[PDB]
Structure formats: structure tokens, C-alpha cells
Design a binder for this molecule. Sequence first.
Ligand SMILES: [Mg+2]
Ligand SMILES: [Mg+2]
Ligand SMILES: [Mg+2]
Ligand SMILES: [Mg+2]
Ligand SMILES: [Mg+2]
Ligand SMILES: [Mg+2]
Ligand SMILES: [Mg+2]
Ligand SMILES: [Mg+2]
Ligand SMILES: [Mg+2]
Ligand SMILES: [Mg+2]
Ligand SMILES: [Mg+2]
Ligand SMILES: [Mg+2]
Ligand SMILES: [Mg+2]
Ligand SMILES: [Mg+2]
Ligand SMILES: [Mg+2]
Ligand SMILES: [Mg+2]
Ligand SMILES: [Mg+2]
Ligand SMILES: [Mg+2]
Ligand SMILES: [Mg+2]
Ligand SMILES: [Mg+2]
Ligand SMILES: [Mg+2]
Ligand SMILES: [Mg+2]
Lengths: 191, 139, 109, 195, 148
Amino acid sequence: MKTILSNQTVDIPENVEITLKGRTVIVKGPRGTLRRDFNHINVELSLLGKKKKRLRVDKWWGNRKELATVRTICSHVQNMIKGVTLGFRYKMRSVYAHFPINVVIQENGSLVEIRNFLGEKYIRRVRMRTGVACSVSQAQKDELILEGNDIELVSNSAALIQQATTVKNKDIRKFLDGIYVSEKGTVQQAD
Amino acid sequence: VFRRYVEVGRVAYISFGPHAGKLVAIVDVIDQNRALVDGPCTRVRRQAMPFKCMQLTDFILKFPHSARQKYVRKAWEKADINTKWAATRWAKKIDARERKAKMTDFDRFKVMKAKKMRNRIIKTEVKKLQRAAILKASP
Amino acid sequence: SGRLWCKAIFAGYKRGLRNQREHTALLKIEGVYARDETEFYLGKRCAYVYKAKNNTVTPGGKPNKTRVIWGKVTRAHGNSGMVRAKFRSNLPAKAIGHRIRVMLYPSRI
Amino acid sequence: QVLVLDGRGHLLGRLAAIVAKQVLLGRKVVVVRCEGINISGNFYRNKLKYLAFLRKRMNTNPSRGPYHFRAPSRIFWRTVRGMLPHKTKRGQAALERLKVLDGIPPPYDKKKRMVVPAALKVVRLKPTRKFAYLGRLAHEVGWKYQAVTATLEEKRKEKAKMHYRKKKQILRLRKQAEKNVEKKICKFTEVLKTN
Amino acid sequence: ERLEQQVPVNQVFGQDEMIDVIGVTKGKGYKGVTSRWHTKKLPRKTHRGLRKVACIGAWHPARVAFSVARAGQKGYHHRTEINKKIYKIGQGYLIKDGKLIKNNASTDYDLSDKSINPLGGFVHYGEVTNDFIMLKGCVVGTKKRVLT
RNA sequence: GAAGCUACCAUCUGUGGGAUUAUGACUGAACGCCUCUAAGUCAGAAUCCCGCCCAGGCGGAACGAUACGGCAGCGCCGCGGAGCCUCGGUUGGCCUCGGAUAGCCGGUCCGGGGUCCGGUGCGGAGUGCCCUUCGUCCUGGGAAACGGGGCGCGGCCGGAAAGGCGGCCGCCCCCUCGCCCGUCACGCACCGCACGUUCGUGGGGAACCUGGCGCUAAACCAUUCGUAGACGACCUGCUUC
RNA sequence: UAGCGACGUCGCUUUUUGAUCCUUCGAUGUCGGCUCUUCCUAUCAUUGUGAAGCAGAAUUCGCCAAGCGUUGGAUUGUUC
RNA sequence: GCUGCGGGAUGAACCGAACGCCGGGUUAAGGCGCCCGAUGCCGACGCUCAUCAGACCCCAGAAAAGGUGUUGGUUGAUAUA
Ligand SMILES: [Mg+2]
Ligand SMILES: [Mg+2]
Ligand SMILES: [Mg+2]
Ligand SMILES: [Mg+2]
Ligand SMILES: [Mg+2]
Ligand SMILES: [Mg+2]
Ligand SMILES: [Mg+2]
Ligand SMILES: [Mg+2]
Ligand SMILES: [Mg+2]
Ligand SMILES: [Mg+2]
Ligand SMILES: [Mg+2]
Ligand SMILES: [Mg+2]
Ligand SMILES: [Mg+2]
Ligand SMILES: [Mg+2]
Ligand SMILES: [Mg+2]
Ligand SMILES: [Mg+2]
Ligand SMILES: [Mg+2]
Ligand SMILES: [Mg+2]
Ligand SMILES: [Mg+2]
Ligand SMILES: [Mg+2]
Ligand SMILES: [Mg+2]
Ligand SMILES: [Mg+2]
């Protein structure tokens, strides 16, 4: 019905600095930096306040389908702040009912080599997206920790790893085997 | 971003229409496509004009919403919009366009003759400034 | 010296969709793109100038290969500044897309 | 006597109609940088339309049938030919006035380009509407010179950048000279008649 | 640096290298449909002959399709053959220490005096005294025909 | 039974990239939560396109040779002269990229950041320069030290996607009324009239008189060959060692 | 409601037959078989998929899907 | 049929309109992005996004049923206890 104004405010901590040359948002924090182009949203972004620096997102004369993106923008900024402050760590555990899945890292966790998945001789090589590092965690059996900054990259690499081990021509209910993302959290705690 | 807003007390310029070339005061917004405009001191009556018909300016006046003419003209005179309107780079460009359109044949001839004297000296000085910059950047 | 006429293009004769009227021609004069601007050119003479292989006598000077068809502006056409014209003899169909110079001989303002 | 119309940002039909109407009058039109012509609608939608057009072909002899072009300049040329009366002598003679070209060649890099606002995507389509680039659409179907086109475009852009820097330096020197010679140049006529 | 100079084949090619051969096939002249497209022959009881195509096309393409087998010229076509393995790169008639040394077609297991040209010379071809290339299988083109 | 044709009746070879469909997924609001979707991302195939291969357009490029002999003939530069066919124009605009919820200009500092002007665009194409000039002569004010045109020379190729005009410096036959304002005096003042003024030393073809610098062939036919041929066409040879 | 689904009801097709006789009576050569090209998809198999009363194997129901194949014979003129 | 003409791209029956040869103006039906004359009006309000959009009596295509895709309406029931 062409709503007049739709505004959403996002708070910013003291650790991270955020900047905008336009719809482009750049967040600089303790662990690396993030930058995203929002040229396909068509929404106003303005930071205001000293020592607080709250970011408001404003939409004027938007329909029911256009008023939805003003919250997705704030959610993306929240995810960027969370990843640049604490980071995103996905623990993926592998179910290996009979055949043990042998996962190894190739080059600084940028490449995952999976051997002996359901007894197949095929070697599955999955490369991680830039900025995501994977490792075999200790004090636990058959798990992989994938740590990074950008959530849309960490979860993308996790989904790639999960879909690499997929049963074919067999039952999906039966033959429960493969690496599934068990836990999702941050690298830094107490926040 | 978005340093101009329509509101109760915004003076706007009419780009086209029956009252083209005059300033009005937006009293209130009606149906997100047209707004009531007063323009008491600009010789225009109170009526509804579309948003796309008007062009926003920088000056803002303090009116209560849906105010009368005796209360909007007083604030117009208090803000003193008319005299300060000529002291801007926008009304000056508009008047410049009007004068260029009102040019006559003698005026065009005089302008053409003055261009010969004006542009040539500028060109001969640019030819010296360029060589001066070249000699400066030579070492 | 200098040009003393306005430029106009011959787009076609006055026509419907399945028939033509060669007695009246349509002109697209440069600079006029509105109905309220063509009132200045009403009544102005127009000349379609071309060249042939046999030189013909001219009013001033020796004979020349130049041949001109005269006419004048009758009325306006449409809202896009197009204008109408009627010549002594109908324009040849080869003149479509060419130039007819609109003189300023009949002056009113 | 020529009209050098830029291609990037203009809609296919919205620009082709204007060019087809202006060519029938006699103005020689040259459409430059045709790989940037945008097309309204989804990219997959336009791809499906082009593939449905490709499917159409004479059965008994495909060589003696519909000639499908892969270059975006030739696509724009066929679009303009679809509106021009090409089966008549007038349209045949007008077809040479149009010069569709990919990239900005030497004969046209130095000429200033024109923009028709009646065909610009910014004013034609809503900011939320999807559009497809003719360059990518053509490259996805049998076009091979997109890489060299982009390389030559980068080269000519790096050249025009230096040219504009020189022009801006000349403009700065001109403004400095104008501010320097305040005396001996009154030119009150220029201000009274507003340039 | 190599202008106005000779280039041997051993510098451009090597042993056990998969190679492509471009050439022109054997000219056979005007051939019928059974010889050009290998269309099945009609029975003996047919009139107007046997070695023809019995049906060109249906009633309503209104024309003859380009995919119908027609009698025309066969052979002498520009063809390319892929995946041809090189077996031997040999040369002879090098020096004059031995008055005429060939040592061609002499493997390390044979170790007998022999040459490339067969006993009695090649058929429709002379001597192969120059360095040669030995490819696997058949190759397109007639004898003494240029191939790339 | 030679040679030649021929057989899945013998022998050799038959190859990968992209955007994606179905589908499974990532982030994620609408709708406090959820959701593969509403904006954005990922994988994705005998299907689609192209790669390999087949023929190359009223498609265009690079290079060689470009007519002896005895009077010839044909090119390049500089040229003055006449005539014929064509159809079209009456100043030229020598350029940043890029967005439209953003960008332009100017700049101290450490390609980006900050600050200062402009912003229904005026360092603007509703724009700006050359310009609206009939010509000649005498003589005053402002501007002008580049001079101002080049049948002229040297240095750079400046620019390859379909390139040739422009700038700089040194001289050359010389030049300070070529620009703006004022001033004394003249000229086709054709007697009211059209096709006038322009890139025209326009494009194309046959020759005429004159200067300078250079060139001295190749196709087709006939004949031969057969790796090719219905006839054409196509693959080849000729030297007196 | 994996797979079917009666009593009812809504659609597509001219690969059957039938209804009418609009062109063809100074003639459009009217069955079947052989050879050969192309197209369609309502997919038998093959490529990639979803669901089962899918433990595996073998199967059944759909989705994008016509690129590639869909044979050899006994009797019948036979289509079948 | 016995009937031309302007629109329906095309046409026997549709819509206007009926016919001697011409010049000027206007109009019916229809139309104004280009074919092709005219919206090149600084036209108004609102709906619509399709990986099968839609685009004008006869006329050349479609139903029952369904959609947490949007846009309006009706009857109702809860909520500072
Ligand atoms: Mg199974
Ligand atoms: Mg091809
Ligand atoms: Mg033979
Ligand atoms: Mg018989
Ligand atoms: Mg075979
Ligand atoms: Mg999907
Ligand atoms: Mg019958
Ligand atoms: Mg017959
Ligand atoms: Mg027949
Ligand atoms: Mg097939
Ligand atoms: Mg009768
Ligand atoms: Mg009657
Ligand atoms: Mg009638
Ligand atoms: Mg009709
Ligand atoms: Mg009626
Ligand atoms: Mg009627
Ligand atoms: Mg009449
Ligand atoms: Mg009407
Ligand atoms: Mg028109
Ligand atoms: Mg439908
Ligand atoms: Mg119809
Ligand atoms: Mg019908």
C-alpha cells in the first residue's frame, strides 16, 4: 500500500569501525575486515552518533515485497559484525556407521580430501572458499571444525562438504553416512 | 543523501503548468501524489498540485498544518523569502536563461563582437601559462 | 553570405495506410518539435532544389544545371511540429528523405 | 552530419525504434558500443527467447533460410531491420546509413558520443526490475570475441583517462587565466546578456 | 635466428607422440548413392534400376531435404584424422665413413642391414632416402600425396 | 595371377568448456520463530550453445610481379588548361569511466580516506570555441611579443580495433591596419524580386601541351602429367645441361 | 490419497470409427510390403533426480528430458 | 449474391459508409513506438513480473480445482484483567 517510511536501527560495538561510500558497507574489526556491495537493495544507509555510531536503514514508498529487505540488510550487517568480532565456526561431525571416513587437510585447510566413504575408491576433493580454514579438532572423533569470518562463505563451504558425501542409487533413510553440520557457533566466547 | 523533504512549510518551485515559474508553500500532503500549496506572496491561490509538477528548494518555513492565509503570509514575510530568493545561484541562472531567450539581434551581434575580444586574450594568456608550467616541470 | 533559409526534410506525402495523396506533402522542419512552434512557418515559401544534366536558364546569371520546384506551407500536421505543404507540381518520390529549403520570403513578424 | 549514439544503458527496442525513425529521414546514424545495450526482463527469459528464435530454421535447407547472427551489433542491426521496410528500395537505401559496431573503433573513439534519454534504462525501467546485458547474452550463444572486446575497451578507457586529465588541466589553466586577467577585460555585455 | 635455415622433423616431433594428420582423401569421382552413402540396394525385381534411393521425401516438405542421400562426387575431401601414434623417426645416408650406410628398419633385436624402402622399391613411389616418420595404421590420401 | 578398386570378410581413429533445467543446498525477512527466495549466493546433467571437424559472403586483410623493342606503354611527385556522367550537402564540436537512495569540481595530509565550492547540473550540448566577413586606403586608443598563412626542412611516430592528422623546438620570402572601439574618402549605387552564398584543387571514366624520379610482366589457349577427371575443373614439367 | 480409487464431474487428441458433404467427376492413380528423410512426446531403455508398503537386488509412481537406439524369424496380402 | 470505399495485418456476410471527374475543411468506425499518417501530451489513478506474461465482437483457443504471490472486501473471534 506504499508505506511512507520503514526504518531499522542497528547498534555497533566499540571494537568495530564501519564505513560506507554508498550502498557499500565496510566493517573493520579485530579479526580482518569485511566489505559488501548492496547496490541491488536500493535502500538508504546512514550512520549517526559519536562513540555509539548506530546505523539506520531507511526505505521510502516500498511495497510489501520491498519492505522485507530492510530487515535482511540489518541482519547481514549483524552477521558481518559477528564474524569480524568473534568469527563463525561450524563443527561438522561425520556419521561412519560401518566404513570410517578418512578426512585430511591438504593446504592450510583450503582443500579437504575424503577417503573411504562408504567403501568407494573415488577420492573426493573439495576446495574451501577463500578465507575459510578447516581443521580436524582434537578430543573428539570424526569431526571437522570450519572457521572463518564471512558466514555466507563458512556455511557455503560446510554445505559443499556435506553435499560431497551424498548417497546415490541407494536408500536415503537407510545408509546414514556422511558429514553433517552438528554445531554452529563463534570462535570467541563470552559474547 | 536525501537532504530535501516535503513537509508542512516547504517552499517549492513550479517547473511546468499554468503557474510555471513561481514559488509555492506546501501546506500538507493529501494523497501521496498531490499536495495543497498556498503561495500567498507569489500571486497564486490555494490549490492542489502534483508532486512531480513542483521542484523542491532549500528554504523551510514554520507553518502549522492546514493553516490559514493570514497565518502563512505572516510567516512568509518573517522568513523574508522573496528578497533572499534573488540572492541565490539558482534564480540567477533562471534569469540568465530568460535574458538569453530575450536576446535581440543587436544584443546577439554585440555578444558575438565581445566574444572576439574576450576569448582571444584568454587564449593568449593560457598559451603563456602552459609554457610556464612546462618550464617549471622541465627540471 | 551565409544561409538564408531553414532546413526541412521530406518524409512523405499526405497518406492514410492503403492510399496516398501526392498533391499534399509533409515536411519535418529542423528545430520544430511541437504544435505551438509551427505557427511561424505557416505561409512560408519552400524550394526543392536538385541538379540535372541539361543546364536551364536561371533568373540571375548564366544557365546552370540547377532546377527548383516551388511551393509553400499550407497548414500544420500533428502535434510533433510536422508541417504540410503544397507545391506547383507534386514532389517526385525520389525526394523522400532529402532537403527542401524553407525560405523566409513571406514575412509576417 | 552523423549521429554517434552510445549503446550502453539504452534498451534494445527503445533505441532501435528511434534509430529506425531517424534513418528514414536521412541522418547517418552510427551506434557504438553495442555490447552494453540492456534488455528488459530476466536474463534466463531473454536467453529462452533467443533460443526459441534459434530453433526456427528451414527444414529442407538450413543454409538457405533464416540467418541467425551471434554478434550483438548484428543483433541490433537485425532488430532495426525488422522495423525498417527493407523489402523496398527506400529501406534498402536507408540500411546503409546505419552503422552498428562492437566496441569503439579508431574512427569513432575521438568523436563525442550522444545519448538518447528516451531509451535509457534508468528512466524506462523501475529500479527493481530485472534486465539482461546484450553482450553477455550474445557471448553465451556462439560469440567468441568478448574477451578481446573487453581488452580493447580497457585500453581505450585507459587512453581516454589520460586525455581527460589533459583536458582538465587545460580547463584549470583557462580558469586561472580568467581569474588572472581581471583588468583590461570588463565584458559587462557578457554578464548583462548572460553569456 | 632460424630464418633461411632448415628444420628437421626430429626437432619438431618426438617418439611416442600422439599426432594429428590433415590431408585430402582419395579421389573416386562421380559415385552413386550406394557407393557414397552406402544405401541398401533395392531387390532385383525393381524397375528403373536397383542402386538408387527408393524414397526421397514425404509429400509436404514441398522440397527435397538436404539430409537425403544424393548421387554426386565422392572422394578428394579435406579430412583430418586424430590420435595417430608415432612409432619411428629414422634417417639414413648420413656420412661417408661407410660408403653408403642406411641402417634403417634395423631394430636392436634384428641388428641386420636393411632399409625403409621394401625389396624392389615402393609401389607408385621412389626412394625414401630422407628422414621419415612411421605412423600407426592407415592414413588418408593416395601415394606421394602431401600431408600435414 | 601383377597393378588398381573393394569387404565388420582385413586394418586405424572417433576427443572438452560455459551458462543452466529437474533437484538438493547457503545466508535470509516478509510473518518476534521457521522457510532454497522476496532481494542476493552454491553444486548441477545423454538436454542448449560453443570447442574439434566440414564449405567458406556482392566480407575484409598481408605480401610478390606489375607490360621494350624500334617509335612505345604504364606508375610516383609537382603541375598549370578544356570538356563529359553522377547525385548529395550550404561552418566545423579533437573523446574520461560510471551510478541514478548519487555524483561533479577543487586539493593539505597519509590508488583510497578528510576538508572546501557547485548540485533540477553554468568548468553546464536549453552548452562552448571558430564565428553572422563585401572589399580597398589615411589616421588614433586597448590587446598582442606567440608572430601569421605554408608549393618549405630536420627531430617523434603521438596512435593498430577499420591508423595520418595534430602538437612541440630550431630556421626559411617576409610580416607588427590579421582582433575590439573611433575617424576622412572610394569601389557593378544594375534602378522591388527565383535556381545566391559552401567541405568542390566533390566521385568516376577517355584523351590533349609541359618538368623531375623510376618500371621493363603475368594470366588464359596449345602440349605434357594423373595424386584428378562425365565435359569443365584440379595436381605437375620444359635448361640445352 | 506409497500404489489404486467406485458413485459423480471437468478437459485434450484427431494415431480408430462415426455424423455433414465444403474443394475435387473435361480423373489428385484408391490396400499392404520394401528403401529413405524429418518431426512430435503422452519416455521402453540410456544421462542427472524426488517418493515407496525403497534392508540389498529386482521393481512401481513423477519431474527437466526426443541427443542416441527401440531388432532377427515361423503362418497370414494383410493394418492388426 | 446485385457492391465498390475507410478500419478488423490477411478476408463474403463484422464495424462505419454506400460510388460521376476534381480542390479545400471536417468526421464515422478505427488508431497515434517503428513498418505506417498521427500523443515527440514535462497526461491522470490504480493493478500486474510470467523458466509458457498480456495485448480489442464475429476472430482463430480452453475448463472443473488449487496458491502463506500480491492487491481490495465481508462476516467473526481474541488482546494492558
Ligand atoms: Mg535398489
Ligand atoms: Mg558454427
Ligand atoms: Mg579414378
Ligand atoms: Mg517389373
Ligand atoms: Mg566403413
Ligand atoms: Mg531453485
Ligand atoms: Mg466427401
Ligand atoms: Mg493426372
Ligand atoms: Mg500427382
Ligand atoms: Mg532424433
Ligand atoms: Mg448467380
Ligand atoms: Mg440490391
Ligand atoms: Mg455492401
Ligand atoms: Mg478493408
Ligand atoms: Mg450495429
Ligand atoms: Mg453498418
Ligand atoms: Mg476531399
Ligand atoms: Mg475513434
Ligand atoms: Mg509516423
Ligand atoms: Mg495461462
Ligand atoms: Mg485478426
Ligand atoms: Mg479458421
